[PDB]
C-alpha cells in the first residue's frame, strides 16, 4: 500500500481523477484527490485568491497531515506541476517520488515564472484557441483569469476522450489563474529541498495543449529519475488512458 495524492491542473478539479482513483484503490492503495482553491466544488471564488500559495493551500493542508511514519506519491498534470513544486519545497521528506504527467517541472535554478516564459517562446500566441482571458483583482496591479473555450477543450485537451468526459468538463470547469504576476514574486525553490525529491515524468504523446517535444524539453533541461510514455494519452491522460496512468504509476512507485 502507498498513498497517492493527485493534483489537477488549472480550470479543472479533483473530479478529473474519477476514472483513476478507483483503479489505484482496486490494486490496494490509498488515494487523495484534492480540489485547489476555486477549483471543482471548493467553496472559494477566483477573485478572492490572488497568490499561488493561496491557490495551492488545499494540497498543503493534505501534506501537513501525512503522519510522521508515512510518505506519499504525488501525481500532477499541467499547471499541477507547480503545486507539486511547492509541496516538494515545503515537505520534501513526505514525498517518496513526485510524478509529473504532461506538467511543468520547476527547476531550483530559475524564477518560478520560467516554464511560462519558455512556453510563450515555444508556442504560438493563439495556442489557447477560443479560451478567453480577463484581468481581475486591482486595476492597479492585475491578475489574469482564464476560461477554457469549448473548442480548445474538444480539440486540444479531450480529443482522445469520450464525448461524455468532454461534456462533464464543460459542466464543471471554472475560471482559472496561472498566477504569473505572483509567481514572479515567489521565493525560488532550492536544491536542498525541492531538488532532493526523486522525480518522475509521464509523457502524453498526444497532448495538443502541451506538445510532447516541450514535455521532452523539461526532462532534458531539469532531469527526471524515471520517465514513461503514453503513446495515446491526450492532455487528459487520466480520462483517455486511465489504465495506462495506473500501470505507469505502479511501475514508478514500486
Ligand atoms: C488550463 C489550460 C492550460 C493550457 N496550457 C497552459 C496553461 C494550462 C495547461 C496546464 O493546466 C497547459 C500547459 C501549459 C500552459 N502553460 C504552460 C507553461 C509551461 C508548461 C506547460 C504549460
CSV table of C-alpha atoms and ligand atoms in Angstrom, one decimal:
chain,number,residue,atom,x,y,z
A,1,UNK,CA,0.0,0.0,0.0
A,2,UNK,CA,1.1,3.5,-0.9
A,3,UNK,CA,-0.7,6.8,-0.6
A,4,UNK,CA,-1.1,8.8,-3.9
A,5,UNK,CA,-2.0,12.5,-3.7
A,6,UNK,CA,-3.4,13.6,-7.0
A,7,UNK,CA,-3.3,17.2,-8.2
A,8,UNK,CA,-5.3,18.7,-11.1
A,9,UNK,CA,-4.3,21.4,-13.5
A,10,UNK,CA,-5.8,24.9,-14.0
A,11,UNK,CA,-9.6,25.2,-14.6
A,12,UNK,CA,-10.1,21.6,-13.5
A,13,UNK,CA,-10.7,19.8,-10.3
A,14,UNK,CA,-10.5,16.7,-8.1
A,15,UNK,CA,-13.2,15.2,-10.4
A,16,UNK,CA,-10.8,14.5,-13.2
A,17,UNK,CA,-9.4,11.6,-11.3
A,18,UNK,CA,-12.7,9.8,-11.1
A,19,UNK,CA,-11.6,7.2,-13.6
A,20,UNK,CA,-8.1,6.7,-11.9
A,21,UNK,CA,-8.9,6.8,-8.2
A,22,UNK,CA,-11.0,3.5,-8.3
A,23,UNK,CA,-8.1,1.8,-10.2
A,24,UNK,CA,-5.4,2.6,-7.7
A,25,UNK,CA,-7.7,1.5,-4.9
A,26,UNK,CA,-8.7,-1.8,-6.6
A,27,UNK,CA,-4.9,-2.5,-6.6
A,28,UNK,CA,-5.0,-1.8,-2.9
A,29,UNK,CA,-3.7,1.7,-2.4
A,30,UNK,CA,-4.9,4.9,-0.6
A,31,UNK,CA,-5.8,7.9,-2.9
A,32,UNK,CA,-6.4,11.6,-2.2
A,33,UNK,CA,-7.8,13.8,-4.9
A,34,UNK,CA,-7.7,17.4,-3.8
A,35,UNK,CA,-9.7,20.5,-5.1
A,36,UNK,CA,-7.4,23.5,-5.2
A,37,UNK,CA,-8.8,26.9,-4.1
A,38,UNK,CA,-11.6,28.0,-6.5
A,39,UNK,CA,-11.5,24.8,-8.5
A,40,UNK,CA,-14.0,22.0,-8.6
A,41,UNK,CA,-16.5,22.3,-5.7
A,42,UNK,CA,-14.0,24.2,-3.5
A,43,UNK,CA,-16.2,27.0,-1.9
A,44,UNK,CA,-13.7,29.9,-2.6
A,45,UNK,CA,-14.3,32.2,-5.6
A,46,UNK,CA,-11.4,33.0,-8.0
A,47,UNK,CA,-11.3,36.7,-7.2
A,48,UNK,CA,-10.6,36.1,-3.6
A,49,UNK,CA,-7.4,34.1,-4.5
A,50,UNK,CA,-4.5,36.3,-5.6
A,51,UNK,CA,-1.4,34.3,-4.6
A,52,UNK,CA,-0.3,30.9,-5.8
A,53,UNK,CA,0.2,29.7,-2.2
A,54,UNK,CA,-3.4,30.5,-1.5
A,55,UNK,CA,-4.4,28.6,-4.7
A,56,UNK,CA,-2.2,25.6,-3.6
A,57,UNK,CA,-3.5,25.7,0.0
A,58,UNK,CA,-5.7,22.6,0.0
A,59,UNK,CA,-2.7,20.5,-1.3
A,60,UNK,CA,-0.6,21.9,1.6
A,61,UNK,CA,-3.3,21.1,4.1
A,62,UNK,CA,-3.0,17.5,2.9
A,63,UNK,CA,0.8,17.4,3.1
A,64,UNK,CA,0.8,18.8,6.7
A,65,UNK,CA,-1.4,15.8,7.7
A,66,UNK,CA,0.9,13.0,6.4
A,67,UNK,CA,1.7,11.1,9.6
A,68,UNK,CA,5.5,11.2,10.6
A,69,UNK,CA,5.7,7.5,9.7
A,70,UNK,CA,4.4,7.9,6.1
A,71,UNK,CA,5.2,9.1,2.6
A,72,UNK,CA,3.1,9.9,-0.4
A,73,UNK,CA,3.4,9.6,-4.2
A,74,UNK,CA,2.3,12.9,-5.9
A,75,UNK,CA,0.8,12.9,-9.4
A,76,UNK,CA,0.2,16.3,-11.0
A,77,UNK,CA,-0.7,17.3,-14.5
A,78,UNK,CA,-0.4,20.5,-16.5
A,79,UNK,CA,-0.3,23.5,-14.0
A,80,UNK,CA,-0.5,20.9,-11.3
A,81,UNK,CA,3.3,20.5,-11.6
A,82,UNK,CA,3.7,23.9,-9.9
A,83,UNK,CA,1.8,22.7,-6.9
A,84,UNK,CA,3.8,19.6,-6.8
A,85,UNK,CA,6.9,22.0,-6.6
A,86,UNK,CA,5.6,24.0,-3.6
A,87,UNK,CA,4.7,20.7,-1.9
A,88,UNK,CA,8.1,19.3,-2.7
A,89,UNK,CA,9.8,22.6,-1.4
A,90,UNK,CA,7.8,22.7,1.9
A,91,UNK,CA,7.6,18.9,2.6
A,92,UNK,CA,10.5,17.2,0.7
A,93,UNK,CA,10.8,14.3,3.1
A,94,UNK,CA,7.0,13.5,3.0
A,95,UNK,CA,7.2,12.6,-0.7
A,96,UNK,CA,8.8,9.4,-1.9
A,97,UNK,CA,8.5,10.3,-5.7
A,98,UNK,CA,6.9,13.4,-7.4
A,99,UNK,CA,5.2,12.4,-10.6
A,100,UNK,CA,4.6,15.0,-13.4
A,101,UNK,CA,2.4,13.9,-16.2
A,102,UNK,CA,2.5,16.3,-19.1
A,103,UNK,CA,3.2,19.0,-16.5
A,104,UNK,CA,5.8,21.7,-16.0
A,105,UNK,CA,8.5,20.6,-13.7
A,106,UNK,CA,10.1,23.5,-11.8
A,107,UNK,CA,13.9,24.0,-11.6
A,108,UNK,CA,15.5,25.5,-8.4
A,109,UNK,CA,17.9,27.3,-10.8
A,110,UNK,CA,15.3,29.6,-12.3
A,111,UNK,CA,12.4,32.0,-11.3
A,112,UNK,CA,9.1,30.3,-10.8
A,113,UNK,CA,7.8,32.0,-14.0
A,114,UNK,CA,10.5,30.4,-16.2
A,115,UNK,CA,8.4,27.5,-17.6
A,116,UNK,CA,5.8,30.1,-18.5
A,117,UNK,CA,8.3,32.3,-20.3
A,118,UNK,CA,9.6,29.3,-22.1
A,119,UNK,CA,6.0,28.3,-23.1
A,120,UNK,CA,5.5,31.7,-24.7
A,121,UNK,CA,8.8,31.3,-26.5
A,122,UNK,CA,7.9,27.8,-27.8
A,123,UNK,CA,4.2,28.1,-28.5
A,124,UNK,CA,2.1,30.5,-30.7
A,125,UNK,CA,0.1,33.3,-29.1
A,126,UNK,CA,-3.2,31.7,-30.3
A,127,UNK,CA,-2.4,28.3,-28.7
A,128,UNK,CA,-5.5,28.6,-26.4
A,129,UNK,CA,-8.0,29.0,-29.3
A,130,UNK,CA,-11.4,30.0,-28.0
A,131,UNK,CA,-10.3,30.2,-24.5
A,132,UNK,CA,-10.8,33.8,-23.1
A,133,UNK,CA,-8.7,36.0,-20.7
A,134,UNK,CA,-9.5,38.9,-18.4
A,135,UNK,CA,-7.9,40.8,-15.7
A,136,UNK,CA,-9.2,40.7,-12.1
A,137,UNK,CA,-8.1,42.0,-8.6
A,138,UNK,CA,-6.8,45.6,-8.5
A,139,UNK,CA,-6.9,47.5,-11.8
A,140,UNK,CA,-3.6,49.0,-10.4
A,141,UNK,CA,-1.8,45.5,-10.4
A,142,UNK,CA,-4.0,42.9,-12.0
A,143,UNK,CA,-4.3,39.1,-12.1
A,144,UNK,CA,-5.3,37.3,-15.3
A,145,UNK,CA,-8.2,34.9,-15.2
A,146,UNK,CA,-8.9,32.4,-17.9
A,147,UNK,CA,-11.8,30.3,-19.1
A,148,UNK,CA,-11.3,27.3,-21.3
A,149,UNK,CA,-13.1,27.6,-24.7
A,150,UNK,CA,-15.4,24.8,-25.8
A,151,UNK,CA,-13.2,24.1,-29.0
A,152,UNK,CA,-10.0,24.3,-27.0
A,153,UNK,CA,-11.4,21.6,-24.8
A,154,UNK,CA,-12.7,19.3,-27.6
A,155,UNK,CA,-9.6,19.8,-30.0
A,156,UNK,CA,-6.7,20.3,-27.7
A,157,UNK,CA,-7.5,18.7,-24.2
A,158,UNK,CA,-10.1,15.9,-24.5
A,159,UNK,CA,-9.6,14.8,-28.1
A,160,UNK,CA,-8.8,11.2,-27.3
A,161,UNK,CA,-11.6,11.2,-24.6
A,162,UNK,CA,-15.3,10.2,-24.9
A,163,UNK,CA,-17.8,13.0,-25.6
A,164,UNK,CA,-19.1,12.2,-22.1
A,165,UNK,CA,-15.8,13.3,-20.5
A,166,UNK,CA,-15.8,16.3,-22.7
A,167,UNK,CA,-19.4,17.1,-21.6
A,168,UNK,CA,-18.6,16.7,-17.9
A,169,UNK,CA,-15.8,19.2,-18.1
A,170,UNK,CA,-17.9,21.8,-19.8
A,171,UNK,CA,-20.3,21.4,-16.8
A,172,UNK,CA,-17.5,21.6,-14.2
A,173,UNK,CA,-14.7,23.7,-15.5
A,174,UNK,CA,-14.4,27.1,-13.7
A,175,UNK,CA,-12.3,30.3,-14.4
A,176,UNK,CA,-8.6,29.7,-13.5
A,177,UNK,CA,-5.4,31.7,-13.0
A,178,UNK,CA,-1.7,30.8,-13.8
A,179,UNK,CA,-0.7,33.2,-11.1
A,180,UNK,CA,2.2,34.7,-13.3
A,181,UNK,CA,2.5,38.0,-11.5
A,182,UNK,CA,2.6,36.3,-8.1
A,183,UNK,CA,4.8,33.5,-9.2
A,184,UNK,CA,7.2,36.3,-10.3
A,185,UNK,CA,7.4,37.3,-6.7
A,186,UNK,CA,7.6,33.9,-5.1
A,187,UNK,CA,10.8,32.6,-3.4
A,188,UNK,CA,12.6,30.2,-5.7
A,189,UNK,CA,12.9,26.5,-4.8
A,190,UNK,CA,16.2,25.2,-3.6
A,191,UNK,CA,18.1,22.1,-4.5
A,192,UNK,CA,18.5,21.2,-0.8
A,193,UNK,CA,14.7,20.9,-0.6
A,194,UNK,CA,12.7,20.7,-3.8
A,195,UNK,CA,15.8,19.2,-5.5
A,196,UNK,CA,16.2,16.3,-3.0
A,197,UNK,CA,12.8,14.8,-4.1
A,198,UNK,CA,13.0,12.0,-6.7
A,199,UNK,CA,11.1,13.0,-9.7
A,200,UNK,CA,9.2,11.1,-12.4
A,201,UNK,CA,7.7,12.1,-15.7
A,202,UNK,CA,5.0,10.6,-17.8
A,203,UNK,CA,4.8,11.8,-21.4
A,204,UNK,CA,1.4,12.0,-23.0
A,205,UNK,CA,2.4,11.9,-26.6
A,206,UNK,CA,-0.8,13.3,-27.9
A,207,UNK,CA,-1.3,16.2,-25.8
A,208,UNK,CA,-2.0,19.1,-28.2
A,209,UNK,CA,-2.1,21.7,-25.4
A,210,UNK,CA,1.4,20.9,-24.1
A,211,UNK,CA,3.2,19.3,-27.2
A,212,UNK,CA,5.5,16.2,-26.4
A,213,UNK,CA,8.6,17.9,-27.9
A,214,UNK,CA,8.1,20.5,-25.0
A,215,UNK,CA,7.3,18.0,-22.3
A,216,UNK,CA,10.5,16.3,-23.5
A,217,UNK,CA,12.3,19.6,-23.0
A,218,UNK,CA,11.6,19.7,-19.2
A,219,UNK,CA,13.2,16.3,-18.8
A,220,UNK,CA,16.2,17.3,-20.9
A,221,UNK,CA,16.8,20.6,-19.0
A,222,UNK,CA,15.8,19.6,-15.5
A,223,UNK,CA,16.1,15.8,-15.4
A,224,UNK,CA,13.9,13.0,-14.0
A,225,UNK,CA,14.8,9.8,-12.2
A,226,UNK,CA,12.1,7.7,-14.1
A,227,UNK,CA,10.4,8.5,-17.3
A,228,UNK,CA,7.4,6.7,-19.0
A,229,UNK,CA,5.2,7.3,-22.1
A,230,UNK,CA,1.6,7.0,-23.0
A,231,UNK,CA,1.5,6.8,-26.8
A,232,UNK,CA,-2.1,7.8,-26.9
A,233,UNK,CA,-2.8,10.0,-23.9
A,234,UNK,CA,-4.1,13.4,-24.7
A,235,UNK,CA,-3.8,16.3,-22.3
A,236,UNK,CA,-6.3,14.4,-20.1
A,237,UNK,CA,-4.5,11.1,-19.9
A,238,UNK,CA,-6.2,10.1,-16.7
A,239,UNK,CA,-9.5,10.2,-18.6
A,240,UNK,CA,-8.4,8.9,-22.0
A,241,UNK,CA,-6.0,6.2,-20.8
A,242,UNK,CA,-6.8,5.7,-17.2
A,243,UNK,CA,-5.4,2.1,-17.1
A,244,UNK,CA,-2.1,3.2,-18.6
A,245,UNK,CA,-1.6,6.0,-16.0
A,246,UNK,CA,-2.4,3.5,-13.3
A,247,UNK,CA,0.2,1.0,-14.8
A,248,UNK,CA,2.8,3.8,-15.2
A,249,UNK,CA,2.2,4.9,-11.6
A,250,UNK,CA,2.6,1.5,-10.0
A,251,UNK,CA,5.8,0.9,-12.1
A,252,UNK,CA,7.2,4.3,-11.0
A,253,UNK,CA,6.3,3.7,-7.3
A,254,UNK,CA,7.0,0.1,-6.6
B,1,LIG,C1,-5.6,25.0,-18.2
B,1,LIG,C2,-5.2,25.1,-19.6
B,1,LIG,C3,-3.8,25.3,-19.9
B,1,LIG,C4,-3.3,25.3,-21.2
B,1,LIG,N1,-1.8,25.2,-21.1
B,1,LIG,C5,-1.1,26.3,-20.3
B,1,LIG,C6,-1.9,26.5,-19.0
B,1,LIG,C7,-2.9,25.3,-18.8
B,1,LIG,C8,-2.3,23.9,-19.0
B,1,LIG,C9,-1.9,23.2,-17.7
B,1,LIG,O1,-3.0,23.3,-16.8
B,1,LIG,C10,-1.5,23.9,-20.4
B,1,LIG,C11,0.1,23.6,-20.3
B,1,LIG,C12,0.8,24.8,-20.1
B,1,LIG,C13,0.3,26.0,-20.0
B,1,LIG,N2,1.3,26.8,-19.7
B,1,LIG,C14,2.4,26.1,-19.6
B,1,LIG,C15,3.6,26.5,-19.2
B,1,LIG,C16,4.7,25.6,-19.1
B,1,LIG,C17,4.4,24.2,-19.4
B,1,LIG,C18,3.1,23.9,-19.7
B,1,LIG,C19,2.1,24.9,-19.8
